[PDB]
Paper text:
We constructed four mutants R480A, Q482A, G324V and R480A-Q482A (double mutant) to validate the observed recognition site. Each of the mutant proteins was purified as described for the parent protein, and crystal structures of each were obtained. These structures were essentially identical to that of the parent protein, which confirmed that the mutations did not affect the folding of the protein. Neither G324V nor the double mutant were able to form a complex with Fe3+-enterobactin. Unlike the parent protein, the R480A-Q482A double mutant does not coelute with Fe3+-enterobactin. The same titration was carried out with G324V and R480A-Q482A, in both these mutants no binding was detected. A R480A-Q482A double mutant and a more radical G324V mutant have the same structure as the native protein, and did not show any detectable binding to Fe3+-enterobactin (ITC experiments, size-exclusion chromatography and crystallography). Analysis shows that for the double mutant, the lifetime of the Fe3+-enterobactin complex is reduced by four orders of magnitude compared with native (10–3.8 and 100.8 s, respectively) indicating only a transitory interaction. When the double mutant was expressed in bacteria, it was inactive in 55Fe-enterobactin binding and uptake assays. We conclude that the double mutant PfeA is not competent for the uptake of enterobactin in vivo.
In Gram-negative bacteria, Fe3+-siderophore complexes are recognised at the bacterial cell surface by highly selective outer-membrane TonB-dependent transporters (TBDTs). These transporters bind the Fe3+-siderophore complex and translocate it into the periplasm. The structures of pyoverdine, pyochelin, citrate and ferrichrome iron complexes bound to their respective transporters FpvA, FptA, FecA and FhuA showed that the ferric-siderophore complexes were bound inside the barrel adjacent to the plug domain, a position thought to be poised for translocation. Pseudomonas aeruginosa, a serious opportunistic pathogen, does not make enterobactin but does possess a TBTD outer-membrane protein PfeA, related to FepA, that binds and translocates Fe3+-enterobactin into the periplasm. PfeA has the same two domains (22-stranded β-barrel and N-terminal plug) common to the TBDTs.
Residue numbers in the entry: 16 to 721
The structure:
Amino acid sequence: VVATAQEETKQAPGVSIITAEDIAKRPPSNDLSQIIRTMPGVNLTGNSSSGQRGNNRQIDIRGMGPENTLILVDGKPVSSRNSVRYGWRGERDSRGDTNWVPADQVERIEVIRGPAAARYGNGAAGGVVNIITKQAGAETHGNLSVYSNFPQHKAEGASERMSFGLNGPLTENLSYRVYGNIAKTDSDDWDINAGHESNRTGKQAGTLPAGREGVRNKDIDGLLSWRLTPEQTLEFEAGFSRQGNIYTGDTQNTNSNNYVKQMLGHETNRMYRETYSVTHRGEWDFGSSLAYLQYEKTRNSRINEGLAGGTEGIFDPNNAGFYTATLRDLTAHGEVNLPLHLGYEQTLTLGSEWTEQKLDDPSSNTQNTEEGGSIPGLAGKNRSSSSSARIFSLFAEDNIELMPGTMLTPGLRWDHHDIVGDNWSPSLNLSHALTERVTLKAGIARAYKAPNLYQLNPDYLLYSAGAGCYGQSTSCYLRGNDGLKAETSVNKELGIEYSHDGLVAGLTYFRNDYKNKIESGLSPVDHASGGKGDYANAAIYQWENVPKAVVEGLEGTLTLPLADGLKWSNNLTYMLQSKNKETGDVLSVTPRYTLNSMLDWQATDDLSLQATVTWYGKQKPKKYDYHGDRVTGSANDQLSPYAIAGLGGTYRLSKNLSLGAGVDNLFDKRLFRAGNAQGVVGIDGAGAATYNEPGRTFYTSLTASF
C-alpha cells in the first residue's frame, strides 16, 4: 500500500531529517537552531536585512528569510514570535521560535525546504521545521539529561541545561508522557564588542553594539493518550514555557541611555507560551484519519520603548515599566487518507484546517499624528490595540504509483483569508528510478504566506522625520494596509542522487519565484495634513507588495563509508541569487556558500568520536539605504570566508548511562558585531558585520535513561 503524499514527499531533495542520535552526538547549547542550521540549504540569519536585532539569529531556509520558516511541534504550528512588534525593516526584537522544546526530549526534526513544504500552507514559503517529541512506548521509560558548556573567552555566555522525561502506560487503555526542563544561556558581556564597533562620534561616542542576549527557560509538558477502541485514540496535551532574557544592551540603532545601562544583566523581556491540544486518531476499514485542535496563548511582557524620536527602539526613560502583548492562536485540522487500488495504486488525502489569530498589542499602535499631520480614516490617539485574522483551508493530495520506481504526487490547497481573500496553492512532486541506484526527483509548487497582523492593520502606524523615508528627505508615515495581497512563491527543485551501500552522492538545483513579498512602501500614496514645522504634511507610505523577487542555488551531498566503523558526510550549499527585483537589493544576507563536513568514527561498541568542519563563504550587505541611495563607507563592509571546526565523543558506560564531551570552534575563530548595516547620526554602519560568532567552547553532557 502506497504511502500518503505527506509521507512520500519527505523523500524530496529538499528534505533533511535530524535524529535524536544526531542531536546527542552534536548537542546544542540550548536553542535547537544550533543543529538545525547545519542542514543543507539552511542558514542562521538575522530577521532583517537592516541588521537591526542582528544577534538574534534564526533559521532561514534557502535565503528566504526567517519570517518564511514555519516552525511546527509534532505537526502543530508555533506562532509565538508574532506577539513581538514587526518593524519598518521587518525587524523583530525576538529570539525566534526554535527554543520552546528541550533538545534531549526531541525524537527527530524534519527540515522541509522548497516545493515539498508548500502543502503546509500559510507561512511555508521558505520551508518547514517540524520538531517531533519523543512519545510513550509499551513499557515505562524515562530519562534525565544534563548539559553544560565552558567558553574559552569569559565575555561569551555559557549555557547550562537539565531536562527529564517520563512516559509509559498508566492503565490498560491509558498512557502518559511528560517532560520538563530548566536552562540558562548567559548573555555575552556588555563590552564584548568594544574594540570592534563601527566609528561613533559626538553624542554617540562610547556606544556599543551588544553581543548575544541571554535566556532562562522553564518548560513542562504533559500528554495523556487514551485508547477508546482498537480503531480510536484520543490525546490530550498541555505545555507551559517561560523564557526570560538577560539583557546586554541591545537597542535598535545601537545607542544607549541610562535606562539601558541600568538594565544590563537583568530581565527586560519575558515570554510565556501556553499550549493546549486535543487530537483524535482513527484506524478504519477504508484507511485512516487525523483531527486536532490546538490553542496557543503567548504573552510577551517587556519594557516600554518608543516608535520614533529619541526613544525609537530603546527603553523609554519617561515611561518606565513593562507592557504585555497577547497572542491567541487557535488551529483546527482534519483529514482522511484513502488507499485506492483500481487504475494506479494510489493514496488520496483529503483535509481541511481553520486558524484564527488574535493579537492584542498596546504599544504598537500608539504613534500619534501631532508632528507629521493627521491622516483621514486614522484616529491620532487611543486606537484599538487588537487585530485578528482567520484562514479556512481545503486540500486534496494524491500519491500515485505509475510503475514501480515512479511516483507522482499532485496536490491542491485552497485558503480563504477573511480579509485578504482566496488563495490557490497547486503542488506537484515526483520521484523516478533511473537505475537501481540512481533517482531523479523534482518538484514545483506555489507556497502561500498571508500578511502578518502588523502589516495588515490600518491602525499600525510608524513615523519618521526624514531618515527612514524612501525617495525623499522630509517626514513620513508608514501605515498598515488591509487590502494587501498574500505573498506567494513558486518554488521548484530538480535533484539527482546516487545511492548504494550507504554511499550517497547527490545534487539539487532550486529556485523560488517569490511574488508580492510585503515590504515598506517606496512611493507615497497620499499626504497627511497639518503638523508642526517643516515636517508638517508628511508623506503617507503603505506596507506594499513587491512584484518579484528570486532566490536560486544548489545543494549537494556526499557521504562516503571510508571503512566499517567510519563515515564521512558532507553537504554543500551554494547561493546563486537572492534579489529583490524592484529595489535591485539583496533579499536575505546569507553566506555565499556553506560546506558542512563530518567525520564519524565508531571507535568501539561503547565509544564514538566525531570531527566536524564548516566553511562559510563571503557575506555582502544591502547596497542601498532607506532612501534608496547607494550606501558608502563602512556600510559596504563584507565578511570574509571562514571555517569553524569541532571535536566530540560519546562514551556509553552502560545501557543506562552515557556521557558526551567535546569542543566547538576549536581554532577559536571569532567575529564581533560592529553595528547595523547602515548608520544613523553619529554611528557608522557596519555592513555585513552584524553578529557575534562565539569562540572556542568546551562542553560536557550526561544522559541517564531506562
